[PDB]
Structure formats: C-alpha cells, structure tokens
Amino acid sequence: EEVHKEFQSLSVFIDSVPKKIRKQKLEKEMKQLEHDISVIEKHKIIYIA
C-alpha cells in the first residue's frame, strides 16, 4: 500500500525530469513485491535450501 499510496499521492501531470525518474523507483519495487507474493501463493508447502 505505502508504495501504491505514494503512487497514489503522485502528481497527475508530470512535466519535470526529477518527477519522471521517481515514478520508476516505485515501479521497480512494485514489480518486485508483486512477483514475491505471486510465487508464495503457488503452493502452501515451501521446500527450500
């Protein structure tokens, strides 16, 4: 949420370059966290090494 709430808090019109980079930083975290929760829901059993 806090990443997406930050994504939600974001300005709608993004004209400046330092805005345009700080959009991506969240999306790098956003893709990462979604990937992790996706794979742990695949099975309940976690046989790991």
């Binding site: 794979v39 099975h43 059993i45 976690i46 046989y47 790991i48 090494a49």
Partner: peptide, 11 residues
C-alpha cells in the same frame, strides 16, 4: 506441487 526457492532468493 511444492515451491522451491534458492537461499539467496529467500534471504
């Protein structure tokens, strides 16, 4: 039917 993750990934 089991997730397998590497140790570096888990850390």
């Amino acid at each position: 039917q089991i997730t397998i993750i590497p140790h570096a990934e888990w850390e």
